[PDB]
Amino acid sequence: SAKMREWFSETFQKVKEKL
């Protein structure tokens, strides 16, 4: 499983999208 790992990818790009 990977709830926080798969989300990790959706967290780094969440910061780049905000910029």
Distance CA 9, CA 4 (A): 9
Distance CA 17, CA 19 (A): 5
CA distances to 5, 17 from 9, rounded to whole Å, are 7, 12
Please give the method by which this entry was determined.
NMR
Three-state secondary structure along the chain? CCCCHHHHHHHHHHHHHHC
Distance CA 3, CA 16 (A): 21
Q: What's the one-letter identity of residue 5?
A: R
The separation between the first and the last C-alpha atoms of the chain, rounded to the nearest angstrom, is 30
